Each structure stands twice: as structure tokens, then as C-alpha cells.
């Protein structure tokens, strides 16, 4: 039946969700997550949105500001607003499923509230698709796809130029932070293919 969600856990407690439409499937997923990792997910949400100080104090004010300064929330919301009903169902279903369990938790905290909530002095609130999306954006996009030191690289290059002179300073920079190194082991063998682009390595800008 269209409204049925069957959840089965194996010998290690790993859940398997059975459902007939997108929203129900992800609802099942969100529900088991709320059962297994509610405190971890709540803290990850605060981590990815910069709302840790609200529950942990002044030690995390700089952290929260740093997180907010590194993204543009309205832009993420706009991406969500442009999704098709089918894609939206993934995010909506997921959030709705976690809410069903969170609601149960807040109704019978005496037995269902994870101890950490009591330890850290606060209770869990509901989630929205934006929150689900931000778990991914803040922990995959910002941790594994936002690496750069260009400003400091420029400072290094300036310092090198001051110590060794213009042309030599540029050459040393190329020795310490080369653009490409042809002896680097490559996952794809050279016989298969090579990258066709050649890049400037003289700060021509």
C-alpha cells in the first residue's frame, strides 16, 4: 500500500526501509536516523548552521560566526525551491520522518530522550528540508571541497621575491608549489589519456 513503510533491522541493527513512493522511502530513512543518531544529527545541524553557542556557550561564538560567514543560506533555499516535486520529496520525506520520531521523543522523554540532551540541557526541535540539505553542504562541500590558500600563497610569493629577487623568487615558488609535476603517480595511466589544459605559472594576473 502507498502509505506503508516497513522497517527491518538486521543483526547489527542496520535498518532496511521498504516503501512504495519517494516521500515514504525517505521518511523511513529519516525516522531510523532519528532513532539511532538524534543527538549526533542535532549537533551536526548546529555545526553546519553555526548555532552551537546557543546550547554550549561563549567558547563557540567564533566558530558560529565563521560557519555563517562561509555560506549564503538564502541561495541554498532558492535551490530547494526550484526542485521538482519528485526531488523535493527526498528532502521533505527525510525531514518529516525525523520529525515523526522527534515528536514521539518529546511526548515521552522519560524513556525516549537520548541522555545527552539531559546532559547538555536542551531538547530537540523539528527539521525542514533546508536542514537536511545543510548537513550535506556543511560537511561534504565545506570539508572536502572548499580548500584554498591563495591569499597566503601570494604572501609567500611576495616574501620569496623580497628574499631572492623577482625572477628567482617566482622560480622558487614554482619549486615549492608547482602547478603540475609529471612524475606524480596518476590513478589513470598516461597510455589511457592526459589532461589537455596547460596553465599559467607566472602569476600573470
Amino acid at each position: 500500500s502507498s502509505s506503508e513503510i516497513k522497517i527491518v533491522r538486521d543483526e547489527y541493527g542496520m535498518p532496511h526501509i521498504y516503501a512504495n513512493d519517494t516521500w515514504h522511502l525517505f521518511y523511513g530513512y529519516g525516522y531510523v536516523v532519528a532513532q539511532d543518531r538524534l543527538f549526533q544529527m542535532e549537533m551536526a545541524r548546529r555545526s553546519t548552521q553555526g548555532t552551537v553557542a546557543e546550547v554550549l556557550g561563549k567558547d563557540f561564538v567564533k566558530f558560529d560566526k565563521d560557519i555563517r560567514r562561509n555560506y549564503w543560506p538564502d541561495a541554498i533555499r532558492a535551490q530547494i525551491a526550484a526542485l521538482s516535486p519528485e526531488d523535493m520529496s527526498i528532502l521533505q520525506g527525510y525531514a518529516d520522518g525525523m520529525n515523526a520520531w522527534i515528536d514521539k521523543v518529546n511526548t515521552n522523554p522519560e524513556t525516549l530522550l537520548p541522555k545527552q540532551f539531559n546532559t547538555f540541557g536542551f531538547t530537540p526541535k523539528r527539521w525542514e528540508p533546508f536542514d537536511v540539505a545543510m548537513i550535506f553542504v556543511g560537511t561534504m562541500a565545506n570539508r572536502f571541497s572548499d580548500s584554498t590558500s591563495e591569499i597566503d600563497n601570494l604572501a609567500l610569493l611576495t616574501a620569496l621575491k623580497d628574499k631572492y629577487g623577482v625572477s628567482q623568487g617566482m622560480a622558487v615558488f614554482n619549486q615549492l608549489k608547482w602547478l603540475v609535476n609529471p612524475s606524480a603517480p596518476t590513478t589513470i595511466a598516461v597510455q589511457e589519456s592526459n589532461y589537455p589544459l596547460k596553465f599559467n605559472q607566472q602569476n600573470s594576473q
Binding site: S3, E4, R9, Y12, M14, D21, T22, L25, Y27, Y29, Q35, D36, F39, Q40, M41, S47, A53, E54, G57, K58, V61, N70, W72, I76, Q79, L83, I90, P114, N118, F136, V137, F144, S145, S147, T148, S149, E150, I151, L156, A159, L160, Y164, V172, N174, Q175, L176, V180, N181, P182, A184, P185, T186, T187, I188, A189, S193, N194, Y195, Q201, S204
Partner: protein
Amino acid sequence: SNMWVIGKSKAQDAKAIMVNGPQFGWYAPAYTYGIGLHGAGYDVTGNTPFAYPGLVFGHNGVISWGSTAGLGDDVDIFAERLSAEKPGYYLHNGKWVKMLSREETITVKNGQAETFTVWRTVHGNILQTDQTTQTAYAKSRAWDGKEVASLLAWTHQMKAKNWQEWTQQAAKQALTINWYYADVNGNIGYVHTGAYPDRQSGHDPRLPVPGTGKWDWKGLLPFEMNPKVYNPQSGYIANWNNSPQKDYPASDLFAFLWGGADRVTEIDRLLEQKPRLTADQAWDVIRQTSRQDLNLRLFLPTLQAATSGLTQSDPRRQLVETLTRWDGINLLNDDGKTWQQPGSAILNVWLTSMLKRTVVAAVPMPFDKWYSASGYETTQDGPTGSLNISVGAKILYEAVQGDKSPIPQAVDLFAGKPQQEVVLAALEDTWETLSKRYGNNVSNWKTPAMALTFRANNFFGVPQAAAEETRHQAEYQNRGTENDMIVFSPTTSDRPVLAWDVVAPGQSGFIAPDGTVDKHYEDQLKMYENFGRKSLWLTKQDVEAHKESQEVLHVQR
């Protein structure tokens, strides 16, 4: 993060074998979450970080997938032109343009709230401003605006049944991430996914560019340009955050380099060792690489050459002989706290001295400390992530290779002295440092082993559990936070696919109000420690046969 995919031509007793070791550091509760989805077009099993809708590690009975960080350059910094007369504006294409801004308030428990402003231009959020030069730096990410599409691509890819359907989704993932594929017929594949900018001519991607217009990106490069391979002649695909392809450039981050010295070689050595590998042999590569000192291979030849003419009683020579007799694999002594051989300590002390004498000496402060690390840095809880050859060591390797290095040595790191002289001097420092701590008899040196800790604070440094929930393992292992293996078309089984993973400490992080820990709070911890694994179930028959519990819901959307 590492991965090795073995195709039809290199697999023994199977058509394909995929082994993934994503490295995110170690936490309690588990960094990843186990999940199976069946319905609405999906039929999958595996585990994924933070329980994202899309499984980053898993299979659907037809194909299997995994990932490792790409480390490509998809972020450039634009130097915006400001004006003291027009605050909140910047010069772009001949006009003073208005910056977007938003106010944010940080509520603080037991404290006073703080509000500040976040500024943004056509090139991205402003990172810092320099009123002196009246410059504001904006961070431009090639994936900006495709964050949600990337999450969705990682979800829809789970439904793919072949290379064509899978790459269609790979082309929609915009973050710099290496994606891997294997299937029931023995095919294997790789795609260095992500959006990369199509830059103007002369744009040096390691340094900022002016934001006034002329240096704006032309757009994004097409998917055809993303490095990729399907069924390579080698019969395998290996990666440990190394270069995807010849001539492909890495991230501009100073600490990241793809050069002659790379840890992925350790994987290659093991895969090329024998003509074919069985699933057990493929899994065993985790154990070996997790215990392999990464510097021995790189500097032992140099050390041997330098000590070639010394006498038997010379301590410099004795330290190298110790290294020569070792394969670089670290093993704990029966005390469970020290390593059997002192090689890693010898290399750490030697390498630290060498860097101080070469790379560090050639770089002006305070940038010199960017190249002083030996790669053995840790905490008392052990390393926070994987171990790698340090950036200083990679540069030093190019210098010790001499003419064999394709990198012109603009400055001689040995400053006109014979390399042997500097190598011997570092060895003299090494002997003095270690002999002072352990005595003169090397054979009795019990050097401390690095340990591993499942931390209660998540990678951001934010508590995700109570401190007391921290868990410790005696043996540090340079391996995936989780390890998963998928084996297609096994000849030793009638099943079309076999899969296993390990999610430590356990599937559940739940603790009841009275302190009662969930039944699956720590049942994968020992399994993790000794390289064990548990079966991942996919089919209804297997799931029902291994069923521990069930709950059926009827929900009205």
C-alpha cells in the same frame, strides 16, 4: 581516503572487487550510518556519512560505488576593488556595484548575543578586507549554486545499472570528488567529478585575481574534460588522494602536492605484486597499508648511499642498517604500547632535522613552518586523520632525486654542500636525540606506537556525544574510518554479489535517560580493531533471514 578497484583481468575467483577506505578521522558515535533502501526505484545497501540521503559507499546488486576526495582546484580568490567613499560597493565592469549583505545574530547560552554582517559579491562571500589597500577578497567556488544538485546526484546514482546511467549522474556532482564504479560483469570505472572553472588566458590558479571584470571565469569546463577511465589496461584503479591524471593540477592549498613522492605507490606495489588478487588478498591491502611507514621507501636509498663508506662502529651507519632490515611495516610489541622496530622514530627525527636544514632554511619566516612538519605529528589521542608524506618531505624528495626530478631546483636546498654531508649530519642529530632517550643499544629501543581514538567531538570540534563516550584503540591504523568491500560474480559462491563493511563503534549512538546504552552502541569496535567485517544484506530473502526487529508504519502525507 583510499580505494582500489580490481577488474576482470586482475581478479581471482571473481569478476570485480572494490575496496574503499574513506578517511574522515574517527568519532563516537560513528562517522557513517548503515542503511538499506528498497522501493521507489531504489534497491541498495551500504553506509554513508551523516546519513545523507545518498549512499556514498554501497551497491545495488548490479553496480557498486565509492569515493575519495579529489583535491582539484575549484576555488579561486577574487580581489575586489573597493572605495572609502562608497562603502558596500565594489568596482565591476566599469560600474560601482552594490554588495549583497545580511545580518546575523549569534545567540549565546549564558552570555550576550553578538551580531555581525556577512558580505557577498558576484564572486562570492567576502573572506577578509584590507582597508589599507581597500581590497576585499571574495571566495569563488565553481560548485556555487550546485550544492543541492550534488546531493541529489549522489542519490540518483544509486539507481544506475550501467556506466552510461552512472556517468549521467556523475556529471551532475559538482564538488571535487573522485567517484568509482564496478559491476557484475567485471567492468570498472573512475571519474574525477566536479565543476571546474574555464579560466581566462594567463590566469595562475594558485594566486588571487583582480575582481574588476577582466579576470572573471568564462564559465565552467564541460564534463568531457573531467578525467575518467573505463576498463583501464592495467586491470585496476587505485587512489589515495593522489593525481587523477597526467598533467592534471591539484588544489592551490600550499599543503597539498602531487609529486614523485606519493602514498598511493604503497597500494600499487601490493596490487602489482601478484598477477591476480582474490577478495581476501584485496581486503588484506587495508591491513598492510594501514601499518606502512610512508617515508622509508622514499629516503632509504639516500640514507644507504650516504652511509656506504662508514665503518661498522659508526652509529650513523647502524641506524641505516636497522632501516635496511625493515620492510617499514609497524607491528605492536606484546606490551600493546610500543612498536617492534624503531624505524618510524628514526625517520621522524631524521626527517625533522633534514627539513630544518633544507626546505625550512630556504623559506622566509613565518612561511618556513609550512614546511617543517615531518608527517608524524600527532596528539596523545593519536592522529586526527590519515598519515601522509608531508609537503616538506615531498619537496625534499624532489631535491634528493637530483636530475631525475622534473622540477627545476631554482634554489639548491643543500645550499652548495654535498647531499651526503647534510644526510649524515641529520643522522648525527638523530643518534644524539634517540640515544639520549633510550640508550646506546638500538636492539632494545621500545619506541611508542601511535594510538587511535574515536572522538566524542565531531570534526568541527563540536561535541556530538559526552566526553566519556570517547573510545580508544591501541593500534593506530592509517585506514578508512569505515572500510567496505563489494565482490561481483564470485566463482566460489552462487550469489551474484558479496558485500561487507564495518561501522564502528556501532550502528546506534542511543543512550536512554537512565544511562542504558543501546544494544548496537559498541558491537563493531573489536571487529574494526582486528580488520574484521560484517555482511551487508541487499535482498529481501537475506534481510528477512537476518532480521532482528521490525516496525511497520502507515503514514498519510
